[PDB]
RNA sequence: GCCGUUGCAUUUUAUGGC
């Protein structure tokens, strides 16, 4: 029935958009459910961001099944326009993937976002 | 020769010494430690008196380069430069003989 | 600075080089002096855990000490309860060094390649060229760390060894 | 090595009788030379031993049953403070041993990566 | 100087002359109008600058001269633009007008014969020009740059003065007055900074008010601040900003917090508020004009005590993405650059009346 | 200035599509 769970609140959404902004600054970001599915195959994916205003929505339902197979966190965001904007990118991106790097300059922000997401998934 | 752009601030009319004191700012990107001679030339063309009616000194530059701040002087006449200036600056500018003793 | 209490002790001696292996240092003097400053803070850190709650000493000399740790870029703001201050450790001051932040921000492909790039009149953070590896970035200066206007990899000159390589081509192949 | 504050420490039998007879506290002494928040522990082997020193050492028992100190359990009837700890230090690599008994202390310097203590809260690294 | 022109009541808004011009360009990014006869300058994402005469208020802007570059000018010392031009600004002497964009250069143009009189390399691969603003009655160019910089030039001598650092994302908007100071935003850092050029200091004002506390307001009786899109300077002692959620924030130089914030202005349409895509004030006055792609320029009157502002009204004559607002006077002539998309190359959704051109609106008294 | 449409009859004025 809901099909839009979990959907994030306000300050977590802008927090995620800022983390995606520095992630696009550090080329540690994947753009597209095609690419995101490939990163879920290679096991390099930290977590997955999906949009809620994508028409249709059922093209994006494969990512929770593949993530729950791989035990990977995921949270919906309401805008695909702002989700495109946080990529340093001027046309919308429906879904983005966070890649794995322990040498990442922004790693603590990624662990805090995974703390909020993994808090919300339970 | 990189568009020197000599900037002046702190201009106060001082008629009792017949002068106008002001802080010379020398921006110099891609140019290092220009002169004392060219400075007296290029600030006398906004006051339009003469080169030897212009005194200047000071100038400890910014660290790294690209900015220089000194202290500049302009008078109303040539004879005022011979009376109101120090005796060694006129030798430095060339306007006098240093009687060595 | 201050020397540690025991100079040769097995689990600590190998713990030196795993710090020297990741960060790429040259002297345990540059390790011990970092612990020395962490020593002096931590004694003061335990002083304000004894006194009364909402002491203005615990406020003025506490929170400014807390905010300065946020200001240097070490204490994350979520742990801003003066109880993570005891849970600080050695690598976090090592992590805020100017050498290691170059490698994290692409651009260095090593921690040892970035060490050479500090001492060769390259990368500046503000408009000041920094050539000391321990410059301790203040977290408001991260996305200003960049190649210089001069000193190529930044352009407008290719440099004395690239110009000499250009010089060799003109004299034998050309004239 | 990968050991972080808050530290956890094991108080055996020889420790408390060197604390009171030198008038240095248990918890507040541990915060001194470890320089962080400490989580003390006592096992079932150690506490029931001090019931056998009972009529001469009520002082040590009435300090050990304070809620600053936590309860820890093992399940063997017949084990000691001496031998039960060595199995605890074996299968995990994240405890700190507090003692002064040399007969136990030589069983601690052999397993690498194990922090020791001293006369009552004046610490020493491995 | 302070606010002294009090004429918000004198504006006859309901019968303002509304007109529109279609032009031969796709996605005009900016418009800059000179006042000493009045001129106009337009740049588009079709690589073109076009010069109009607007001295006749009853007429639509007629065409004088136009210049379009091309792919000839690929290198960066070429005297022509080879990508999208993001901003344009005319000099206060009417002699020059400078353009720049994604080609990361600055080309100074002559107003007379429309010739490339100067090309300046920014010398950074991230030194993209975003907003050019001149000091009133001066020639000191303030250049917002995508490598988080502010670069200051002189026009008459074509030199470089100095650079300001400090921001954390791309500096979109900068506004200035006749004194030597400017307001900047960084547009994702969710702050704005005041810049004193000879003092070489900054005063940092902070947005980012959480709507969660506003939910507290929802218990007493919304949308996220994510991007401070525009900034404008009303007087030397106050200014304003425009956001990504309809909030328009009034700011005082003595107030770290917002001295006012207006809630949703151009409205919504889970739900999406419109972006504050344009914001231009009449200098030293109490009147300012905000614009969206929603189709109606909303104009507001500042109170006399500088504490709140009130609705002057709406002008519905301009459908499409308003990118830049110019206001000239003698009467008042309002021009607005309507493009099919947002300035930044951004995506726009389902816009009614997709058209490109210039909005004109004359208000008497 | 690409197309369509209307009043002046197209220059002029207003509107829809790419």
Curated annotation (Swiss-Prot), chain A:
GO terms for biological process: box C/D sno(s)RNA 3'-end processing; maturation of SSU-rRNA; maturation of SSU-rRNA from tricistronic rRNA transcript (SSU-rRNA, 5.8S rRNA, LSU-rRNA); mRNA splicing, via spliceosome; snoRNA guided rRNA 2'-O-methylation; spliceosomal complex assembly. Pfam families: Ribosomal_L7Ae. SUPFAM superfamilies: L30e-like (SSF55315). Changing residue 55 to A: Impairs binding to U4 snRNA, but not U3 snoRNA. Causes pre-mRNA splicing and pre-rRNA processing defects. GO terms for molecular function: RNA binding; U3 snoRNA binding; U4 snRNA binding. Common component of the spliceosome and rRNA processing machinery. In association with the spliceosomal U4/U6.U5 tri-snRNP particle, required for splicing of pre-mRNA. In association with box C/D snoRNPs, required for processing of pre-ribosomal RNA (rRNA) and site-specific 2'-O-methylation of substrate RNAs. Essential for the accumulation and stability of U4 snRNA, U6 snRNA, and box C/D snoRNAs. This is 13 kDa ribonucleoprotein-associated protein. The gene is SNU13.
Swiss-Prot record, chain B:
The modification N-acetylserine is found at residue 1. The keyword Transit peptide does not apply. There is a cross-link at residue 20 (Glycyl lysine isopeptide (Lys-Gly) (interchain with G-Cter in ubiquitin)). The keyword Ribosomal protein applies. The modification Phosphoserine is found at residues 13, 55. N-terminally acetylated by acetyltransferase NatA. Also partially acetylated by NatC. One of its GO terms (cellular component) is cytosolic small ribosomal subunit. One of its GO terms (biological process) is cytoplasmic translation. One of its GO terms (molecular function) is structural constituent of ribosome. It comes from the Eukaryota. Transmembrane segments: none annotated. It is found in: Cytoplasm. Keywords: Acetylation, Cytoplasm, Isopeptide bond, Phosphoprotein, Ribonucleoprotein, Ribosomal protein, Ubl conjugation. Belongs to the eukaryotic ribosomal protein eS24 family. Component of the ribosome, a large ribonucleoprotein complex responsible for the synthesis of proteins in the cell. The small ribosomal subunit (SSU) binds messenger RNAs (mRNAs) and translates the encoded message by selecting cognate aminoacyl-transfer RNA (tRNA) molecules. The large subunit (LSU) contains the ribosomal catalytic site termed the peptidyl transferase center (PTC), which catalyzes the formation of peptide bonds, thereby polymerizing the amino acids delivered by tRNAs into a polypeptide chain. There are 2 genes for eS24 in yeast. This is Small ribosomal subunit protein eS24A. It comes from Saccharomyces cerevisiae (strain ATCC 204508 / S288c) (Baker's yeast).
Swiss-Prot record, chain C:
Residues 96-170 form the S4 RNA-binding domain. The modification Phosphoserine is found at residue 173. Keywords: Cytoplasm, Isopeptide bond, Nucleus, Phosphoprotein, Ribonucleoprotein, Ribosomal protein, Ribosome biogenesis, RNA-binding, rRNA processing, rRNA-binding, Ubl conjugation. InterPro entries: Ribosomal_uS4 (IPR022801), Ribosomal_uS4_CS (IPR018079), Ribosomal_uS4_euk/arc (IPR005710), Ribosomal_uS4_N (IPR001912), S4_RNA-bd (IPR002942), S4_RNA-bd_sf (IPR036986). Pfam families: Ribosomal_S4, S4. GO terms for molecular function: rRNA binding; structural constituent of ribosome. The keyword Ribosomal protein applies. It is found in: Cytoplasm; Nucleus, Nucleolus. GO terms for biological process: maturation of SSU-rRNA from tricistronic rRNA transcript (SSU-rRNA, 5.8S rRNA, LSU-rRNA); ribosomal small subunit biogenesis; translation. Signal peptide: none annotated. Present with 106000 molecules/cell in log phase SD medium. There are 2 genes for uS4 in yeast. Component of the ribosome, a large ribonucleoprotein complex responsible for the synthesis of proteins in the cell. The small ribosomal subunit (SSU) binds messenger RNAs (mRNAs) and translates the encoded message by selecting cognate aminoacyl-transfer RNA (tRNA) molecules. The large subunit (LSU) contains the ribosomal catalytic site termed the peptidyl transferase center (PTC), which catalyzes the formation of peptide bonds, thereby polymerizing the amino acids delivered by tRNAs into a polypeptide chain. NCBIfam families: PRK04051.1, uS4_arch. This is Small ribosomal subunit protein uS4A.
UniProtKB/Swiss-Prot annotation, chain E:
It is found in: Nucleus, Nucleolus. Its main location: nucleus. Belongs to the WD repeat RRP9 family. Keywords: Acetylation, Coiled coil, Nucleus, Phosphoprotein, Repeat, Ribonucleoprotein, Ribosome biogenesis, rRNA processing, WD repeat. The WD domains are required for nucleolar localization and U3 small nucleolar RNAs binding. The chain holds residues 130 to 570 of 573 of the full protein. One of its GO terms (cellular component) is 90S preribosome. This is Ribosomal RNA-processing protein 9. The lineage of its organism: Eukaryota, Fungi, Dikarya, Ascomycota, Saccharomycotina. One of its GO terms (molecular function) is U3 snoRNA binding. Involved in nucleolar processing of pre-18S ribosomal RNA. Required for efficient pre-rRNA cleavage at sites A0, A1 and A2, and biosynthesis of 18S rRNA. Present with 5130 molecules/cell in log phase SD medium. GO terms for biological process: endonucleolytic cleavage in 5'-ETS of tricistronic rRNA transcript (SSU-rRNA, 5.8S rRNA, LSU-rRNA); endonucleolytic cleavage in ITS1 to separate SSU-rRNA from 5.8S rRNA and LSU-rRNA from tricistronic rRNA transcript (SSU-rRNA, 5.8S rRNA, LSU-rRNA); endonucleolytic cleavage to generate mature 5'-end of SSU-rRNA from (SSU-rRNA, 5.8S rRNA, LSU-rRNA); maturation of SSU-rRNA. Interacts with UTP25. Component of the ribosomal small subunit (SSU) processome composed of at least 40 protein subunits and snoRNA U3. WD repeats lie at residues 80-119, 124-163, 166-205, 223-261, 272-310, 317-357.
């Amino acid at each position: 029935n809901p099909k839009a769970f979990p959907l994030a609140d306000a300050a977590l959404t802008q927090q995620i958009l800022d983390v995606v902004q520095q992630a696009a600054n550090l080329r540690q970001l994947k753009k597209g459910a095609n690419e995101a599915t490939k990163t879920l195959n290679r096991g390099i994916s930290e977590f997955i961001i999906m949009a809620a205003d994508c028409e249709p929505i059922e093209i994006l339902l494969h990512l929770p099944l593949l993530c729950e197979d791989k035990n990977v966190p995921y949270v919906f965001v309401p805008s695909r326009v702002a989700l495109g904007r946080a990529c340093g990118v001027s046309r919308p991106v429906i879904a983005a993937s966070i890649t794995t790097n322990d040498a990442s300059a922004i790693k603590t922000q990624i662990y805090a976002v995974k703390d909020k997401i993994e808090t919300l998934l339970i | 020769s990189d568009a020197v752009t000599i900037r002046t601030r702190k201009v106060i009319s001082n008629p009792l010494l017949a002068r106008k004191q002001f802080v010379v700012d020398v921006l110099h990107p891609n140019r290092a430690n220009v002169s004392k001679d060219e400075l007296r030339e290029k600030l006398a063309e906004v006051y339009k008196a003469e080169k030897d009616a212009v005194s200047v000194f000071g100038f400890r530059t910014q660290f790294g380069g690209g900015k220089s701040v000194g202290f500049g002087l302009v008078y109303n006449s040539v004879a005022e430069a011979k009376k109101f200036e120090p005796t060694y600056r006129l030798v430095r500018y060339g306007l006098a003989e240093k009687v060595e003793k | 600075y201050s020397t540690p209490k025991r100079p040769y002790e097995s689990s600590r001696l190998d713990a030196e080089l795993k710090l020297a292996g990741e960060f790429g240092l040259k002297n345990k003097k540059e390790i011990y002096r970092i612990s020395f400053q962490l020593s002096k803070i931590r004694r003061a850190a335990r002083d304000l855990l004894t006194r009364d709650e909402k002491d203005p000493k615990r406020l003025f000399e506490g929170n400014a000490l807390i905010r300065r740790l946020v200001r240097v870029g070490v204490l994350s703001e979520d742990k801003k309860k003066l109880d993570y201050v005891l849970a600080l450790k050695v690598e976090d001051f090592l992590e805020r060094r100017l050498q290691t932040q170059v490698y994290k921000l692409g651009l260095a492909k090593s921690v040892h390649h970035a060490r050479v790039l500090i001492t060769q009149r390259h990368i500046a953070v503000g408009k000041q060229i920094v050539n000391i590896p321990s410059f301790m970035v203040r977290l408001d200066s991260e996305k200003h760390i960049d190649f210089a206007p001069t000193s190529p990899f930044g352009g407008a000159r290719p440099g004395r060894v690239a110009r000499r390589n250009a010089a060799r081509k003109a004299e034998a192949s050309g004239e | 090595q990968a050991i972080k504050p808050p530290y956890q420490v094991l108080i055996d039998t020889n420790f408390i009788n060197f604390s009171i007879q030198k008038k240095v506290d248990i918890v507040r002494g541990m915060m001194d030379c470890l320089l962080a928040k400490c989580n003390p522990l006592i096992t079932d082997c150690v506490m029931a031993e001090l019931e056998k020193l009972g009529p001469k050492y009520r002082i040590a028992l009435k300090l050990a049953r304070d809620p600053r100190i936590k309860r820890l359990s093992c399940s063997h009837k017949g084990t000691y403070a001496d031998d039960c700890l060595v199995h605890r230090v074996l299968q995990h690599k994240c405890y700190i041993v507090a003692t002064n008994d040399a007969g136990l202390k030589q069983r601690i310097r052999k397993i690498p990566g194990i922090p020791l203590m001293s006369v009552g809260g004046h610490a020493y690294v491995i | 100087g302070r606010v002294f022109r009090y004429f918000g009541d004198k504006l006859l808004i309901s019968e303002a002359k509304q007109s529109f011009t279609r032009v031969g360009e796709n996605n005009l990014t900016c418009i800059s109008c000179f006042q000493p006869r009045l001129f106009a300058y337009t740049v588009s994402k079709d690589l073109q600058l076009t010069k109009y005469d607007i001295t006749d208020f009853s007429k639509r802007p007629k065409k004088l001269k136009y210049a379009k570059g091309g792919a000839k000018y690929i290198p960066n010392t070429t005297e022509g633009h080879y990508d999208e031009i993001l901003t344009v600004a005319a000099s206060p002497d009417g002699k020059y007008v400078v353009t720049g964009g994604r080609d990361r250069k600055l080309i100074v143009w002559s107003t007379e014969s429309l010739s490339p009189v100067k090309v300046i390399p920014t010398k950074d691969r991230r030194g993209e020009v975003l907003s050019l603003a001149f000091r009133k009655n001066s020639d000191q160019l303030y250049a917002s740059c995508a490598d988080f910089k502010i670069r200051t030039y002189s026009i008459n001598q074509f030199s470089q003065l100095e650079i300001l650092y400090g921001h954390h994302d791309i500096v979109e908007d900068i506004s200035a007055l006749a004194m030597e100071r400017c307001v900047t935003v960084g547009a994702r850092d969710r702050t704005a900074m005041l810049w004193k050029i000879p003092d070489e200091t900054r005063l940092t004002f902070r947005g980012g008010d959480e709507p969660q506390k506003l939910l507290r307001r929802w218990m007493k009786e919304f949308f996220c601040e994510g991007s401070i899109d525009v900034v404008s300077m009303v007087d030397d002692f106050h200014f304003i900003t425009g956001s990504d959620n309809g909030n328009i924030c009034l700011w005082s130089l003595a107030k770290k917090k917002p001295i006012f914030t207006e809630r949703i202005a151009h409205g919504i349409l889970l739900l999406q508020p419109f972006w504050i895509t344009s914001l231009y004030a009449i200098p030293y006055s109490n009147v300012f004009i905000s614009g969206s792609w929603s189709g109606s320029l909303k104009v507001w009157k500042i109170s006399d005590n500088l504490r709140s502002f009130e609705l002057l009204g709406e002008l519905s004559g301009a459908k499409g993405v308003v990118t830049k607002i110019q206001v000239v006077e003698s009467k008042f002539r309002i021009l607005a650059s309507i493009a099919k998309e947002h300035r930044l190359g951004r995506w726009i959704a389902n816009v009614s009346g997709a058209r490109n051109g210039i909005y004109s609106a004359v208000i008497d008294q």
